[PDB]
Amino acid sequence: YPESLSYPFGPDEGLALSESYTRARDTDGLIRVKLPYGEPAWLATRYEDARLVLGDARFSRALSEEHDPPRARKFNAQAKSMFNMDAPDHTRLRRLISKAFTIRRVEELRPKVHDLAHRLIDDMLAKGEPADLVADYALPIPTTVICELLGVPFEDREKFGRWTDAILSTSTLNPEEGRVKRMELVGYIGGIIAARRAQPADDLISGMIEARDVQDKLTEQELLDHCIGLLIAGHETTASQIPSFVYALLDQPQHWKRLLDDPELIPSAVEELFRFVPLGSGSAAPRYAREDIEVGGTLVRAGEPVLVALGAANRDGLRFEDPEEIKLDRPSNHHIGFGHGIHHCLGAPLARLELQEALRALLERLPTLKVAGDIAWKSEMMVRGPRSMPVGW
């Protein structure tokens, strides 16, 4: 075992990845990391190693329960979500929920997201520069979508935004905030669930309630924890990615310009930005080896955790030529920005649609878009990206 390195590596600001990732990915075998909490772990940074750990069934998410897992947050809720499980329980839960999220299902949302984006832009223009691209655009878009899909009132977004912020915090200042704010959110969601039981609506929460109450296909806690997981993943991810994508395109303005000239390139460009633009401030959730297994030149013994550095793997020059360059037309772009295998992002079709429409509207309406102040990047959070992003035009 190599001496453990402190992790996460950072940085928080901009789109760079720490040189420590490059060094690790260049080095034979896996490296060892120690996070603020839990046991030390292996870190996988090469593309092939990442995909083995994420997609080979000899690695487990469920086994985490037998451990004090490597992590940046003190509280481990051990939620009953599909993401914390292996087959067959993962399969059961995903099978029920995924119908709401397929390309085929979410496509009807495209004009709705399009129209919302344009209305938000109308409002930014009416006010006058500067706008905050986060508060005025990037946050409302995905929040509106997940609220309407799940059945969580958009009017409550200040409340649940506060809880989300606390739950995502990796700050040692007030280390109990995540745990107690999750309790607040649990009570809130419980209230919504009770409302829908008394009177169902055309939303995913009501659908899951039927799956449990009528079909006995999931437990009460599974129901609760999927409401929570989907609400948070449903908005915070996209809300971070929109401004980061825009920053990438404006920071190297040849890319913004190419998309102005060639809007048909938007889907390809969005894939390249999912490859390049980091979402996590640190790695994928740990996977535990079920049995001894060789990974990237290292024997990972049964019971040992491996963290997958998605962002670093996405810049593996063994797989992606000129990996540190954005190439909007990059071919066979099978990045792992949405993961890979069993826990591949359920929200990927929705995220893709959201990012495509968010960029399309800004490119159409604000071709002269520019950063117009200090970008406050999220710091000491599970996610990376601008918290506020002053823009002009």
Ligand X SMILES: CCCC[C@H]1CC[C@]2(CC[C@H](C)[C@@H](C/C=C(C)/C=C/[C@H](O)[C@@H](C)/C=C/C(=O)O)O2)O[C@H]1/C=C/C(C)=C/C(=O)O
> Among 70, 234, 305, 385, which residue interacts with ligand HEM (rule: CB under 6 A)?
234
Interface of this chain with ligand HEM, residues 35 to 74, rule: CB under 6 A: 54
Question: Per the annotation, does 344 bind a ligand?
Answer: no
Distance of alpha carbon 169 from alpha carbon 177, whole angstroms: 8
Question: Per the annotation, does 335 bind a ligand?
Answer: no
Whether 302 and 289 have beta carbons less than 8 Å apart is answered as yes
Site membership for ligand HEM, residue 245 (CB under 6 A): no
CB of 284 to ligand HEM, least distance (A): 3
> Among 136, 225, 304, 357, which residue interacts with ligand X (rule: CB under 6 A)?
225
Question: Per the annotation, does 90 bind a ligand?
Answer: yes
Q: Which does residue 140 touch among ligand HEM, ligand X, none (CB within 5 to 8 A, set by kind)? A: none
Site membership for ligand X, residue 63 (CB under 6 A): no
CB of 141 to ligand X, least distance (A): 17
- Going from the C-alpha of 38 to that of each of 283, 317, 383, the distances in angstroms are 14, 31, 19
CB of 130 to ligand X, least distance (A): 28
Site membership for ligand HEM, residue 351 (CB under 6 A): yes
Interface of this chain with ligand X, residues 160 to 219, rule: CB under 6 A: 167-168, 182
Question: Per the annotation, does 275 bind a ligand?
Answer: no
Token representation of residue 383 = 């996610």
Whether 266 and 360 have beta carbons less than 8 Å apart is answered as yes
Question: Per the annotation, does 226 bind a ligand?
Answer: no
Q: Which does residue 167 touch among ligand HEM, ligand X, none (CB within 5 to 8 A, set by kind)? A: ligand X
CB of 384 to ligand X, least distance (A): 9
Q: Which residue has the tokens 């451990």?
A: 67
Site membership for ligand X, residue 314 (CB under 6 A): no
Site membership for ligand HEM, residue 296 (CB under 6 A): no
> Among 41, 141, 233, 366, which residue interacts with ligand HEM (rule: CB under 6 A)?
233
Site membership for ligand X, residue 83 (CB under 6 A): yes
Instruction: Tell me whether residue 259 or residue 351 sits nearer to ligand X (CB atom).
Output: 351
Q: Which does residue 337 touch among ligand HEM, ligand X, none (CB within 5 to 8 A, set by kind)? A: ligand HEM
Please choose, from the candidates 358, 257, 254, 382, the residue with its C-alpha nearest in 3D space to the C-alpha of residue 310: 382
What residues are paired with 131 via a beta bridge?
391
CB of 60 to ligand X, least distance (A): 14
Whether 354 and 344 have beta carbons less than 8 Å apart is answered as no
Site membership for ligand X, residue 79 (CB under 6 A): yes
Token representation of residue 361 = 């509207």
Q: Which does residue 338 touch among ligand HEM, ligand X, none (CB within 5 to 8 A, set by kind)? A: ligand HEM
Site membership for ligand HEM, residue 21 (CB under 6 A): no
Site membership for ligand HEM, residue 323 (CB under 6 A): no
Site membership for ligand X, residue 71 (CB under 6 A): yes
Distance of alpha carbon 116 from alpha carbon 121, whole angstroms: 9
Site membership for ligand X, residue 143 (CB under 6 A): no
Site membership for ligand HEM, residue 345 (CB under 6 A): yes
Binding residues for heme b: 90, 94, 287, 343, 345
Contacts with ligand X, residue ranges (CB under 6 A): 71, 77, 79, 81, 83, 167-168, 182, 225, 228-230, 232-233, 236-237, 279-280, 284-285, 382-383
Contacts with ligand HEM, residue ranges (CB under 6 A): 54, 82-83, 94, 230, 233-234, 237-238, 241, 279, 284-285, 310, 337-339, 343, 345-347, 350-351
